């Protein structure tokens, strides 16, 4: 991480309801299902969209990745998952941690745990 | 309940004692002195260890 | 019967090795008794 | 996990056991009351729920006085009261008395308590039998107990730290007799027999510790230090760990040949301490010095077959390797042609603990060199004629006959010792 | 079931 | 003597080869006995009432 | 033994039969040393 | 030492002789 | 995605493996708790070659730790990287082999080998693709040699096509630690010739030499020797873990190194090993690395290559370097030392280049040489084995474990045949 | 809406059933006072399978407790969930069966069976639709084995079409608790063969082995064994109580498991059983679950599957998982271990998936194997029964209860015939 000579949730105006139901959204559930389906290749799209090999992507880049996986995902849901993954960051959350958390919190039945 | 939980607590405390012994030996450096470098600096990189 | 022939050949070699070891042991006993005679005389 | 059962038979056995257990209590921090204010004590002590540690030892004697001394002294709350076993009549320096008539019930009870002890051991490296070759209690009862142990326990490694009669100086008359009998008995039972001589240890104390009036307490302290150095690899971790089973595999070339000389170094008093470096090479040389050996047996006469070194304290494997290279290059030390290596080095990071009130000083390095060498045939040659000189006139033979022996037993024992002499010559010569 | 699987013999 | 049958043996027959003896008994089961073995190799079941 | 019961000279030089020992003249900062290059049991050709 | 070895051999021979006489 | 199953055997093998895993975790930026803390993408790019992911971010070695006594791996667990290892992969008995290969191969190794094979199979089946196994152990020890050879035979039976790599600490030429080293080494070399596909021969005295003469250390403990062995073990497989300008896997190295199947014993060395004083002073260049690696003193094998002839030799370089520079340097080495290189092979050098140097080092290069020099090492071990076997000293300890005397003779015959092949290919003439 | 009538018999059966009800109430968020405190719709969605709603919000198990001595069920009420059961479902005698199958089946079991059947009918009629009955007890005890087999016979008479499931704790191979275990087991097996549609075999020694090797517990009381058994008994019926991606009820499991009516004895296991220290060291994946599931150590039956052949095997998985992943895992297991699977059945696996994992566990899998390996267990029980019966030891106690000697030999004949059928289908060849 280069030296730089505020919270992600505060940015974009994410509401407390969105923060609470970030993983409970049906679109996010579908995204987690797709990520689990693509085992070990889930981060391939994020890697392709990450030019700097820095492991971090901006909001636009990860929304593009999530739309390439599941078309129906909006940017607000992706940003909410970004915030719940890394609470205090100026964007650029690690996509590997993002994918790992989403797959870990993946849910078989949309009625349960949502 | 007291019988069962005392038995479980004894088992967990024995496990925690073993883990604490291993962690203390790791941190203080006395453990595995058989395989500890003679000179503090890293031999290959010629760098001082932390 | 190639495996049986090979096993028989191995057994013959084993007998030869055991005989050689026994001969070597006898030679060692002869050597030590010679040295004992030399030192006592 | 690495439990070792200690047996102390006879006056000499119990008296060296006093020093041994004092040393172990000091080393592990165990107070004489029994408990100490990890798990390194499991080799010699078994802990109870109350926190008190009791030794896995058995004090066997046909005489009550010696055991009652322990029952009354400082370590009265440490040992198990039933573990202290006392007879009613002493063996009176009669191997027959201690092996055929009096020793039967005492050894049966000894096997009972030894069984209780062995049932309490997860692992069992072996037995450490400390007796006195040359006394009826030590020789006869110890031989009978070793025979029973070989019968029942089987392959467990029994290490006999025997005290043999000195060449010229001695305290008994029938000592060559019962020494020959015990030697014939233990040639086929003990796995490794360590020879010790009171004359040699007296000389050690006189010249090194500068004690002009050495006593049995000093002798037993030195022997206890030797045994502690031997067992240190079981209790304390260090580079090049050595095991009780590894002793025989690295040290016994043939089953008959398992008698071994022992030498501890350095042996320095508190006054002259910290006046020399006491480096690894110097202490190795001191250990290999013929004078430092705890048996009146010049190693220059014979050839070393194997030498196991137990290093204690701040010792590094390169130091031990350089020291052993120097020892090999030394021309006074001569090894057998069929053992090019002949060396078993084992280091431990625990320096030898010093007994307060003892004469040894606190040294940061220590060496216990235990060697199988053909020179030990000399002491057997000495006992072989000290025996035959009386056996020609059959002196004191009726004493042994009265308790269930025959002239045939003496004949068989003496023939076995002669065969041992012949075997020593055979292995020593190319 | 020692020999319960023979061919049909002796049709008669 | 074969005693696995605990009820009356209504019928007993030989195989045409003769190595097997079929015993149908009140026990609802038909037991095939191997004469060289002396053991019930098969115990046919499935009859609700007596064979 | 007559040549000297030095652990370094006896063992460290003898290893790989290199028979050469490196003695520094000070710290590593001096960084200059001596290679003894001593083959025991052979005269150097200079004094042969 | 050689004397007493040969004496034990003689004793064994005497025991064998007595057994043969029996 | 070509996984390697690491196995440690015996006291020496376990300690070497612990040091090796410390080195690999440091290279991949893995803290002792297993979490990645390296901050470099290439570190995690191929971390699966050695590590598997746990429920969290934890990364655990694909290592299997074998012994018959528990104290050694109690120390291993107490070591600085003791808790990275999967606790289920610690397979240990209760009573150790008393430096007895018979005890470690037949009596006591028989019971524990089933659990060892279960752990090995469980680790192998989880692998996507398996490059092979690497077994680090010491010839001349009871549990080490015995269990290592037995496990190598079992793994050869189960996975014949998969690569087998061995790091065997051959007993030292001059100063031996235990008496029965010749017996254990002789019995183990026979197994390694038949089973092990690729074998590295290491000597404690050779390492002591390198640490006094190149490294100029004062009182180097076994940790330093294990550190150097770990360096070689990492550098041999760094091409699998990191992108390379001309990469080469273990199978490529074996194919380019082994001319005939039995001639698979190799000497290895690492560069640049320099003392602290001359570190500012030494020039970090490809020619300097080549000059150091081709030195006899750099070898971790006791045998010096000058006596023998280089059948083959692979050099795996690490760092952003000129492939022309590397190839020219090694061609120049061949041309200059053509007397030390076998004539009936036009090129005796396999050059591999990796783009990631080890941490702290601007450059590095590991060397693996198949030369007839090791003939003298095997000859010396035979000279000791025959000396003891003529008088059958200590033979009863092995005989009491239920192995025939005939096995010793067969092992000696096989070892002598290997020596004869090495001499034949030393003095073979073209056409 | 497919109800299950749980019945507990004997001391061991009652303790196992109490632990099972505690586990099920924990899974459904039911406190010991009966009130729901789960805060999840799915927990209450199918609560009627096991529980009935009282006048208030109380939920009561559909459990019937059977015994001849009141001490065991006094402990039952003193247990943590002793208050959920209705007091009317406690059916007790006054003189306990002295480990006597004859006493528990003919003399003392005859009187109390009236109340047992009355309560069973009362509970069964109130059910809308009845899947069947599950009876938990221990073979090798008087009241449990005898009285339970009597109940099973009566219920088979009353409801031939309804499912019958039994969880029998067969006496252990090495360490036997009571002397008359072979007699009681031999008598109960004869009843279970004829009556029980589906039977699971459990062994206390197998439970000790699994809890000492996998869970690595040091002092496992009977509570832990009951805990493992309860986990299996919950997992078998989780498909009825929860939505599944590929659901499978008890009758489906029996249909896919039982080739022939007499071969309905099954050996069960549960995954993932992880030691506390290695909980962070296990990665929860479907392949890991299958690896532990097919391991013989995970089986709670003493007989190991390696000796015999798997006639069939059902695997009920729970959690968010891929149907492709599960199906490929089981097909790959069959292909790898084709030797241990019966040839004349093209597919030997019945895979089911449920969307509700147990609380705390992200994934789980229960295994129910119908294999010929249980032949050796029945053979050992025969080896004990014949040894005791030849000298007629302890036979007078069963004789004095009005049991004819011919009944013992009839039971032995039935159990030997079952062994013969298992051997026949172990060595049956296709075409
Ligand atoms: N090194 C050493 N030897 C001792 C010591 N005490 C006694 N001995 C030797 O032990 C021999 C006799 O020991 P024991 O047989 O136990 O004497 P005891 O207890 O009276 O039994 P018996 O004499 O056989 O009736 C003597 O010849 C001494 O040389 C001692 O403290 N240290
Ligand atoms: N390089 C290195 N060598 C060792 C180490 N520990 C032991 N050795 C050597 O390896 C040889 C064999 O010992 P080993 O096989 O581990 O004993 P075992 O495990 O009981 O069979 C010994 O002679 C030692 O000199 C170590 O940590 N590093
Ligand atoms: N798993 C388990 N087994 C038990 C328990 N209590 C008893 N057993 C076993 O069940 C076997 C039979 O005893 P049991 O049937 O309860 O006696 P009964 O009630 O008089 O019929 C005994 O051998 C015990 O080992 C328990 O709580 N759990």
Coordinates of N, CA and C in Angstrom, one line a residue, chain G residues 7-24 27-35, chain I residues 174-175 205-210 212-213 216 276-278 280-281 295-305:
Chain G
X7 N 40.9 -27.9 18.8 CA 39.7 -28.4 18.1 C 39.5 -27.8 16.7
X8 N 39.8 -26.5 16.5 CA 39.6 -25.8 15.2 C 40.6 -26.4 14.2
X9 N 41.9 -26.5 14.6 CA 42.9 -27.0 13.7 C 42.7 -28.4 13.3
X10 N 42.3 -29.2 14.3 CA 42.1 -30.7 14.1 C 40.9 -30.9 13.2
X11 N 39.8 -30.3 13.5 CA 38.5 -30.6 12.8 C 38.1 -29.7 11.7
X12 N 38.0 -28.4 11.9 CA 37.5 -27.5 11.0 C 38.3 -27.5 9.7
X13 N 39.6 -27.5 9.8 CA 40.4 -27.6 8.6 C 40.2 -28.9 7.9
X14 N 40.2 -30.0 8.7 CA 40.1 -31.3 8.2 C 38.8 -31.6 7.4
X15 N 37.8 -30.8 7.6 CA 36.5 -31.0 7.0 C 36.6 -30.8 5.5
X16 N 36.0 -31.7 4.7 CA 36.2 -31.9 3.3 C 37.6 -32.1 2.9
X17 N 38.5 -32.4 3.9 CA 40.0 -32.4 3.6 C 40.4 -31.1 3.0
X18 N 39.8 -30.0 3.3 CA 40.2 -28.7 2.8 C 41.5 -28.3 3.4
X19 N 41.7 -28.6 4.7 CA 42.9 -28.3 5.5 C 43.3 -26.9 5.4
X20 N 42.4 -26.0 5.3 CA 42.6 -24.5 5.4 C 41.7 -23.9 6.4
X21 N 42.2 -23.0 7.2 CA 41.5 -22.3 8.2 C 41.6 -20.8 8.0
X22 N 40.5 -20.1 8.2 CA 40.4 -18.7 8.0 C 40.3 -18.0 9.4
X23 N 41.4 -17.2 9.6 CA 41.5 -16.5 10.9 C 41.4 -15.0 10.6
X24 N 40.3 -14.3 11.1 CA 40.2 -12.9 10.8 C 41.2 -12.1 11.7
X27 N 37.3 -7.5 13.7 CA 35.9 -7.6 13.4 C 35.6 -8.0 11.9
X28 N 34.4 -8.2 11.6 CA 34.0 -8.4 10.2 C 34.2 -7.1 9.4
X29 N 34.3 -5.9 10.2 CA 34.5 -4.7 9.5 C 35.9 -4.6 8.9
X30 N 36.9 -5.1 9.7 CA 38.2 -5.3 9.1 C 38.1 -6.2 7.9
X31 N 37.4 -7.4 8.0 CA 37.1 -8.2 6.9 C 38.3 -8.8 6.2
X32 N 39.4 -8.8 6.8 CA 40.6 -9.4 6.2 C 41.1 -10.5 7.2
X33 N 41.6 -11.6 6.6 CA 41.8 -12.9 7.3 C 43.0 -13.6 6.7
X34 N 43.3 -14.7 7.3 CA 44.4 -15.5 6.9 C 43.9 -16.9 6.6
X35 N 44.3 -17.5 5.4 CA 44.1 -18.9 5.1 C 45.3 -19.6 5.3
Chain I
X174 N 34.0 -37.9 8.1 CA 35.0 -37.9 9.2 C 34.4 -38.2 10.6
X175 N 33.6 -37.3 11.0 CA 33.1 -37.3 12.4 C 31.6 -37.8 12.4
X205 N 29.0 -32.4 7.8 CA 30.4 -31.9 7.8 C 30.6 -31.0 6.6
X206 N 29.9 -31.3 5.5 CA 30.0 -30.4 4.3 C 29.3 -29.1 4.6
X207 N 28.1 -29.1 5.3 CA 27.5 -27.9 5.8 C 28.4 -27.1 6.7
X208 N 29.0 -27.8 7.7 CA 29.9 -27.2 8.6 C 31.0 -26.5 7.9
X209 N 31.5 -27.1 6.8 CA 32.6 -26.5 6.0 C 32.1 -25.2 5.3
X210 N 30.9 -25.3 4.7 CA 30.4 -24.1 4.0 C 30.1 -23.0 5.0
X212 N 31.8 -22.5 7.9 CA 33.1 -21.8 8.3 C 33.8 -21.1 7.1
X213 N 33.7 -21.6 5.9 CA 34.5 -21.1 4.9 C 33.9 -20.0 4.0
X216 N 31.7 -18.1 7.2 CA 32.7 -17.7 8.3 C 32.0 -17.6 9.6
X276 N 29.3 -11.7 6.6 CA 28.8 -10.4 6.9 C 29.8 -9.3 6.5
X277 N 31.1 -9.5 6.7 CA 32.0 -8.4 6.4 C 32.1 -8.0 5.0
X278 N 32.1 -9.0 4.1 CA 32.3 -8.7 2.6 C 31.0 -8.5 1.9
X280 N 28.9 -5.8 1.7 CA 29.0 -4.6 0.9 C 30.0 -4.7 -0.3
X281 N 30.9 -5.7 -0.2 CA 32.1 -5.6 -1.0 C 31.9 -6.6 -2.2
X295 N 32.0 -23.8 -7.5 CA 33.1 -24.1 -6.5 C 32.8 -25.4 -5.8
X296 N 33.8 -26.2 -5.5 CA 33.6 -27.4 -4.7 C 33.2 -27.1 -3.3
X297 N 33.7 -25.9 -2.8 CA 33.4 -25.6 -1.4 C 32.0 -25.2 -1.2
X298 N 31.3 -24.7 -2.2 CA 29.9 -24.4 -2.1 C 29.0 -25.6 -2.0
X299 N 29.5 -26.8 -2.4 CA 28.6 -28.0 -2.3 C 28.3 -28.3 -0.9
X300 N 27.0 -28.7 -0.7 CA 26.6 -29.3 0.6 C 26.8 -30.8 0.6
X301 N 27.4 -31.4 -0.4 CA 27.9 -32.7 -0.4 C 29.3 -32.8 0.0
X302 N 29.7 -33.8 0.7 CA 31.1 -33.9 1.2 C 32.0 -34.2 0.0
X303 N 31.6 -35.0 -1.0 CA 32.4 -35.4 -2.1 C 32.8 -34.2 -2.9
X304 N 34.0 -34.0 -3.3 CA 34.4 -32.9 -4.1 C 34.3 -33.2 -5.6
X305 N 33.6 -32.4 -6.4 CA 33.4 -32.7 -7.8 C 34.7 -32.8 -8.6

